[PDB]
């Protein structure tokens with residue numbers, strides 16, 4: 001019954017573990033040398049460029065594991081899509097009220113001799129264009145800081161990876177390759193870590209995207225299940241049991 005929502009919850013909490021830990025810890029970012037590249041790979045698996053690859057594969061794969069009760073599965077991926085739309089809607093809509101530095105911006109204004117008092121005594125958009133110019137004077141990492149922003153926004157990356165992971169844990173505990181759960185969990189954590197290491201986000205931001213991710217996934221499961229039909233074990237109790245007893249077979 002409510003079991004999904006239990007697991008989902010637990011999942012959130014689990015994924016809340018690392019960032020709250022970090023958040024409490026007083027850690028700060030600064031230069032290093034090879035980690036940046038791996039973290040950049042991990043974030044690039046969510047960036048779109050590519051993709052859109054991870055996303056589709058996870059989509060279809062989920063649909064396989066989501067068989068039987070697949071009637072709601074599509075509904076589910078529609079709801080998620082809907083909020084996704086809603087998402088890009090709000091994102092693009094307000095870039096006004098942010099006014100917050102990204103971990104690297106602080107180190108920058110410092111390193112570049114920019115009185116913080118004066119730094120915020122200046123405008124709003126001019127600040128951003130100045131961060132752009134200060135960035136202009138590794139390379140790909142610069143490309144990423146430019147492409148992203150001066151101001152820190154919510155974490156899309158976190159939200160996406162975390163929503164996937166949450167979906168994974170929550171709506172399947174009854175096994176289709178539990179490797180999928182463990183992998184989405186570790187991967188999600190890896191994206192969040194990727195954001196931290198790259199001077200992209202403050203730990204609180206990660207915590208919050210994980211929460212948003214939680215609420216989104218929750219509302220989506222409850223609503224998709226409302227109309228019509230849940231998963232729940234599908235007949236697939238017998239089929240999953242049939243795959244379970246195949247584990248001890250050989251003889």
Ligand SMILES: CCCCCCCCCCCC[N+](C)(C)[O-]
Nearest residue numbers: 080084087088156159160163164
């Ligand atoms: C900065 C990018 C804006 C993203 C818009 C909001 C995204 C929330 C969608 C999370 C759902 C991920 N999922 C489960 C469909 O894979």
